[PDB]
Structure 1
């Protein structure tokens, strides 16, 4: 669907001042009031910032928001461990006239050298194609902090549906690891010219492409 864009991750060293930005449009962010939440897995969308600029209750003087055009930003001014959570922004869309959401940002209290993903994409193998099935995999490893955004395109038009993306987990090296896969029909696969995976990580945006090649 069409959402409000936010980086996968934002972060810095303790005490440091970080800020999660969030971009929308003409019809939402820049016409309505951005609301900001703190989420984390285990029922808790705790509202943080209402009416753009205003702080909820039990809301640390540490947080404050803004709003330029079609953009808004939440800056946590004094990074504490208690901050590493998911942050979400939301605005009303008078065009769709439904509440439009941010894709979330994870703030990590950066305890180690930032590292970018090593994106390795794989096409379906033969004894899989031989089995009438074709699955692609975007191994994503050696990265920190542990939050990435993955998109898949099939001929340049991006595939939304069928993509499954693991949740990063600290490897043996302390660095993170994730995989995202797409399940196709051997026809569905040999019915495109190229298949690309696209991981974005704090600033870096790698991307791999693939295309069918074997006794076709």
Structure 2
């Protein structure tokens, strides 16, 4: 019931601020804290008592509060600051609780652009013998970390039986994702071909497979 922008994008060396808006019974009346959650990790306290830093938090991070709002500031932004940021405070209402903002996803665009490498596998004869058919679209080495995937049976869009993962960061700091098209062996054999189309920063890469 605290309000933050859901997402912010910035570049290394920039300054960013993230705002948190509440009411008189939470922020207006209580101290604000800010929590950093790096991907795959637990939240960590960044700022408490509106503007105080725990030991070990660089002074690039600052906070302020006025009225029913609070602000987190980050100067000299680094790629390592890419994280979800949560404001938190106490709500003093008679049924009391800790209250958080919904979180701001801070994306730091700090690597070279990289188009996705796409590999599309047809169903194996082993899986066909098991009376199933799966097309496997593997998408790797792209940056920034967002793609959209569309599938085509011959030339028409197919949306049933599609499952696509969120992008995940690779060791080399590029991103990877997967998409799967589930078909029956009859569907697989009855069409001329199937296609996986990966769109990244408005450019489309496509792979196609066909029954044997």
TM-score class, shorter: 0.5 to 0.7
Alpha-carbon distance in structure 2 between the residues aligned to 1:18 and 1:57: 22
RMSD: 2.6
Q: 1:23 to 1:58 in 2, by over 3 A?
A: same
Alpha-carbon distance in structure 2 between the residues aligned to 1:29 and 1:175: 39
Alpha-carbon distance in structure 2 between the residues aligned to 1:109 and 1:32: 31
Q: 1:28 to 1:53 in 2, by over 3 A?
A: same
Deviation at 1:76, TM superposition (A): 0.6
Is structure 2 residue 189 aligned with structure 1 residue 173?
A: no
Deviation at 1:175, TM superposition (A): 4.1
Deviation at 1:14, TM superposition (A): 1.4
Task: Name the residue aligned to 1:37.
Answer: 35
SS in 1 for 2:45: strand
Task: Name the residue aligned to 1:52.
Answer: 50
- After the TM superposition, list the runs of 4 or more consecutive aligned residues in structure 1 that deviate by more than 2 angstroms: 40-43, 166-176
Task: Name the residue aligned to 1:105.
Answer: 104
Alpha-carbon distance in structure 2 between the residues aligned to 1:145 and 1:20: 22
Alpha-carbon distance in structure 2 between the residues aligned to 1:35 and 1:167: 33
Q: Which runs of 5+ in 1 are unaligned?
A: 113-143, 147-165, 177-216
Alpha-carbon distance in structure 1 between the residues aligned to 2:165 and 2:6: 12
Task: Name the residue aligned to 2:183.
Answer: none
Deviation at 1:30, TM superposition (A): 1.0
TM-score (norm 2): 0.52
Question: Is the CA contact (8 Å cut-off) linking 1:20 and 1:105 kept in structure 2?
Answer: yes
TM-score (norm 1): 0.52
Pairs aligned (count): 124
Q: How does 1:141-156 map to 2 (within 5 A)?
A: none
Q: 1:86 to 1:66 in 2, by over 3 A?
A: same
Question: Is the CA contact (8 Å cut-off) linking 2:79 and 2:110 kept in structure 1?
Answer: no
Kindly name which structure, 1 or 2, has the bigger radius of gyration based on alpha carbons. 2
Q: 1:50 to 1:99 in 2, by over 3 A?
A: same
Task: Name the residue aligned to 2:63.
Answer: 65
